[PDB]
Structure 1
């Protein structure tokens, strides 16, 4: 993270969808960061857990991704991620990310789209 600029930082809880168990499973709580690589100007999401600082999200904010509402929440986004490396080997996930408030979720969407436009260049 030393080669990266911090574009946006917000406290969040991240879930991944378990298709087997038909339920949302928490993956981490802590600071969600949008990091711009000084070398490639590519913006990733990097999220670390409170206390342990373990990575629960590490993926490019792909221009192709779309934030959708969750039926249950006015302060969460659901999106498909095709390549997250938090736990090592690149894996596809259905993520949900929830914030402290609607304002935080709206602001996140704003930054996430700004990052998508940077990643398009």
Structure 2
């Protein structure tokens, strides 16, 4: 709570199992953009419903690129290099889906607005 909530959205997060070519669910819950009041850096923290376990915890790096999935108008895919949700910051290729195309678009703007702030 040493942060401020830039944006909050309901979403379901996927991780891609390379050695399988299948997507795997990782969590359903509230996805939040948290900007730290001390360092002004913004991050992704997403907790799963009821158990309240973290399934996404990484910095919105300005290097990351949001690209759509072949079979979804309401999803974004991006590669992540340092995620510490289970401990140990490892690289993942993530998909995130929302309830509508309106939210997936609104996510894409706030994700870019947070990417700017992150480098000042």
Q: What pairs up with 1:78-89 in 2 under 5 angstroms?
A: 78-89=77-88
- Counterpart CA distance in 2 for 1:37 and 1:60 is 11
Secondary structure of 2:113's counterpart equals helix
Alignment gaps of 5+ in structure 1: none
Distance in 1 (CA, whole Å) between partners of 2:60 and 2:50 is 25
Shift of 1:99: 0.2
Please tell me whether residue 98 in structure 1 is matched to residue 97 in structure 2: yes
Cα distance in 2 between the residues matched to 1:38 and 1:11 = 24
State the Cα distance separating 1:18 from its structure 2 match. 0.0
Structure 2 Cα separation of the partners of residues 94 and 119 of structure 1: 21
Quick one: distance in 1 between partners of 2:35 and 2:42? 4
Question: Offset at 1:44?
Answer: 0.2
Give the alignment's TM-score, normalised by structure 1. Answer: 0.98
Task: Give secondary structure in 1 for the equivalent of 2:8.
Answer: strand
1:83, 1:22 → 2: CA distance? Answer: 21
Give the length in aligned residue pairs: 120
Could you tell me how far apart the structure 2 residues matched to 1:81 and 1:109 are?
16
Query: What's 1:74 paired with?
Result: 73
**Aligned with 1:111: secondary structure?**
helix
Gaps of 5+ in 2: none
Per the TM alignment, residue 120 of structure 1 is displaced from its structure 2 partner at its CA by 1.4
Secondary structure at the counterpart of residue 72 of structure 2: coil
Q: CA deviation at 1:26?
A: 0.3
> Secondary structure, in 3 states, of the residue corresponding to 1:69?
strand
Deviation at 1:21, TM superposition (A): 1.4
Pairing 1:40–2:39 present: yes
Instruction: Supply the RMSD in Å over aligned alpha carbons.
Output: 0.4
When you count strand as a share of all residues, which structure comes out higher? 2
The residue matched to 1:108 in structure 2 has which SS? helix
How far has the Cα of 1:20 moved from its partner?
Answer: 1.1
